[PDB]
Design an enzyme around this catalytic site. Structure first.
Site, mmCIF file in Angstrom:
data_model
loop_
_atom_site.group_PDB
_atom_site.id
_atom_site.type_symbol
_atom_site.label_atom_id
_atom_site.label_comp_id
_atom_site.label_asym_id
_atom_site.label_seq_id
_atom_site.Cartn_x
_atom_site.Cartn_y
_atom_site.Cartn_z
ATOM 1 N N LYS A 46 41.199 -63.155 36.188
ATOM 2 C CA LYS A 46 41.810 -61.910 36.641
ATOM 3 C C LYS A 46 41.119 -60.701 36.008
ATOM 4 O O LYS A 46 40.955 -60.635 34.782
ATOM 5 C CB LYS A 46 43.320 -61.922 36.380
ATOM 6 N N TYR A 96 43.990 -72.402 36.828
ATOM 7 C CA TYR A 96 43.963 -72.397 38.288
ATOM 8 C C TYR A 96 45.052 -73.337 38.809
ATOM 9 O O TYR A 96 45.049 -74.537 38.509
ATOM 10 C CB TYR A 96 42.578 -72.821 38.790
ATOM 11 N N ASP A 140 61.907 -59.956 34.629
ATOM 12 C CA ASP A 140 62.127 -60.502 35.971
ATOM 13 C C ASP A 140 61.208 -61.676 36.315
ATOM 14 O O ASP A 140 60.090 -61.786 35.807
ATOM 15 C CB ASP A 140 61.858 -59.412 37.014
HETATM 16 C C1 LIG Z 1 55.452 -58.413 39.996
HETATM 17 C C2 LIG Z 1 54.143 -59.206 39.802
HETATM 18 C C3 LIG Z 1 53.687 -60.199 40.686
HETATM 19 C C4 LIG Z 1 52.443 -60.925 40.464
HETATM 20 C C5 LIG Z 1 51.654 -60.697 39.360
HETATM 21 C C6 LIG Z 1 50.290 -61.417 39.109
HETATM 22 O O1 LIG Z 1 49.415 -60.654 38.719
HETATM 23 N N1 LIG Z 1 49.968 -62.834 39.347
HETATM 24 C C7 LIG Z 1 48.565 -63.463 39.138
HETATM 25 C C8 LIG Z 1 48.093 -64.695 40.155
HETATM 26 O O2 LIG Z 1 48.350 -64.561 41.341
HETATM 27 N N2 LIG Z 1 47.400 -65.884 39.685
HETATM 28 C C9 LIG Z 1 46.918 -67.077 40.484
HETATM 29 C C10 LIG Z 1 46.298 -68.220 39.906
HETATM 30 C C11 LIG Z 1 45.867 -69.323 40.698
HETATM 31 C C12 LIG Z 1 46.047 -69.328 42.111
HETATM 32 C C13 LIG Z 1 46.675 -68.209 42.772
HETATM 33 C C14 LIG Z 1 47.083 -67.139 41.918
HETATM 34 C C15 LIG Z 1 46.730 -68.504 44.281
HETATM 35 C C16 LIG Z 1 47.156 -67.916 45.466
HETATM 36 C C17 LIG Z 1 47.857 -66.644 45.827
HETATM 37 C C18 LIG Z 1 47.682 -65.257 45.611
HETATM 38 N N3 LIG Z 1 48.685 -64.497 46.239
HETATM 39 C C19 LIG Z 1 49.504 -65.381 46.864
HETATM 40 N N4 LIG Z 1 49.033 -66.674 46.640
HETATM 41 C C20 LIG Z 1 46.077 -69.877 44.406
HETATM 42 O O3 LIG Z 1 45.887 -70.539 45.423
HETATM 43 N N5 LIG Z 1 45.697 -70.315 43.099
HETATM 44 C C21 LIG Z 1 47.570 -62.279 39.301
HETATM 45 C C22 LIG Z 1 46.810 -61.662 38.265
HETATM 46 C C23 LIG Z 1 45.967 -60.550 38.535
HETATM 47 C C24 LIG Z 1 45.884 -60.016 39.837
HETATM 48 C C25 LIG Z 1 46.646 -60.594 40.866
HETATM 49 C C26 LIG Z 1 47.479 -61.698 40.591
HETATM 50 C C27 LIG Z 1 52.096 -59.611 38.398
HETATM 51 O O4 LIG Z 1 51.492 -59.271 37.375
HETATM 52 N N6 LIG Z 1 53.376 -58.894 38.646
HETATM 53 C C28 LIG Z 1 53.858 -57.787 37.688
HETATM 54 C C29 LIG Z 1 53.512 -56.363 38.253
HETATM 55 C C30 LIG Z 1 52.172 -55.892 38.356
HETATM 56 C C31 LIG Z 1 51.865 -54.616 38.873
HETATM 57 C C32 LIG Z 1 52.912 -53.779 39.306
HETATM 58 F F1 LIG Z 1 52.650 -52.564 39.799
HETATM 59 C C33 LIG Z 1 54.254 -54.231 39.216
HETATM 60 F F2 LIG Z 1 55.247 -53.438 39.626
HETATM 61 C C34 LIG Z 1 54.542 -55.508 38.694
#
Ligand SMILES: Cc1ccc(C(=O)N[C@@H](C(=O)Nc2ccc3c(c2)/C(=C\c2cnc[nH]2)C(=O)N3)c2ccccc2)c(=O)n1Cc1ccc(F)c(F)c1
Length: 264
Positions: A46, A96, A140
């Site tokens: 990330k 992952y 949350d």
């Molecule tokens: C509220 C919120 C929600 C989510 C995150 C967050 O980051 N999860 C991380 C993540 O997805 N890992 C990951 C690892 C292996 C994977 C998958 C995913 C995947 C499929 C997929 C993706 N999408 C739907 N399916 C797959 O196949 N293998 C992540 C880290 C960095 C960037 C994106 C995602 C989170 O931080 N927050 C808090 C928050 C943040 C910002 C705001 F403004 C707010 F109000 C609240």
């Protein structure tokens, strides 16, 4: 698969990885599939922009959260391998989870059956009990922050830790500015349980203000298909009074959970 290395270090550079397809997006960072060049280890990287983290005032939260996370070793919590940075951005090295988010599963299935739901709830209750056991209260819990392992095991993926966005999962005491304790996430389980069975959270609404009032009033209803046991469990978790929520022991022993969870 998960027990990679416990020595987290910061001598990692971007040149250690081949970068693959985008896994998801958030406000600050993009998450990508990646493979470590020497070991061929598949993981998720990330990428967050340092300037954005500092501008939003969350960089300290990130340092503290990373430090806490590095200590957490649990099958229903995504394992954190390490981090590093260059001039422009900050890179988090994450497990992952191949089966993706529960959010996507919900979108694909519309709603979950009692078996998927109760297995998921058992996994969450175990994970939160473990987190609570080490002074790590959770904020949350969103279906977007729940991942699925190779065997479909759930992984808690959000940083909602301690030593916002949409409120749907926040308890009244967190939104009313009251005092909150480990019982906040018990509220969260009820919300997630409802959403899993119903396909939307119990206080969903068109606007933030409407939702605020529904949470404050605990104004929600059950559809007819929801069984007597689930109604009873959700009602036990979705109590206005924090003191009225069960212990996690009681949750794990609930007859609807024990009768429905598929967790050998
Ligand atoms: C509220 C919120 C929600 C989510 C995150 C967050 O980051 N999860 C991380 C993540 O997805 N890992 C990951 C690892 C292996 C994977 C998958 C995913 C995947 C499929 C997929 C993706 N999408 C739907 N399916 C797959 O196949 N293998 C992540 C880290 C960095 C960037 C994106 C995602 C989170 O931080 N927050 C808090 C928050 C943040 C910002 C705001 F403004 C707010 F109000 C609240």
């Amino acid at each position: 698969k998960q027990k990679n290395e416990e020595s987290k270090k910061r001598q990692w550079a971007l040149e250690d990885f081949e970068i693959g397809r985008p896994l998801g997006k958030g406000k600050f960072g993009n998450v990508y599939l990646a493979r470590e060049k020497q070991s061929k280890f598949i993981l998720a990287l990330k990428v967050l922009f340092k300037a954005q983290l500092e501008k939003a005032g969350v960089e300290h939260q990130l340092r503290r959260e990373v430090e806490i996370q590095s200590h957490l070793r649990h099958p229903n919590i995504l394992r954190l391998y390490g981090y590093f940075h260059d001039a422009t951005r900050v890179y988090l090295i994450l497990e992952y989870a191949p089966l993706g988010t529960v959010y996507r599963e919900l979108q694909k299935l519309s709603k979950f059956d009692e078996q998927r739901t109760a297995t998921y709830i058992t996994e969450l209750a175990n994970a939160l009990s473990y987190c609570h056991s080490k002074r790590v209260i959770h904020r949350d819990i969103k279906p977007e922050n729940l991942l699925l392992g190779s065997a479909g095991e759930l992984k808690i993926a959000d940083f909602g830790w301690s030593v916002c966005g949409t409120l749907d999962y926040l308890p009244p005491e967190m939104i009313e500015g009251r005092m909150h304790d480990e019982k906040v996430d018990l509220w969260s389980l009820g919300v997630l349980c409802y959403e899993f069975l119903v396909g939307k959270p119990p206080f969903e609404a068109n606007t933030y203000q409407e939702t605020y009032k529904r949470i404050s009033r605990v104004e929600f209803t059950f559809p007819d298909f929801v069984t007597e046991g689930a109604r009873d469990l959700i009602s036990r978790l979705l109590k206005h009074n924090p003191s009225q929520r069960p212990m996690l022991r009681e949750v794990l022993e609930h007859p609807w959970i024990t009768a429905n969870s598929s967790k050998p």
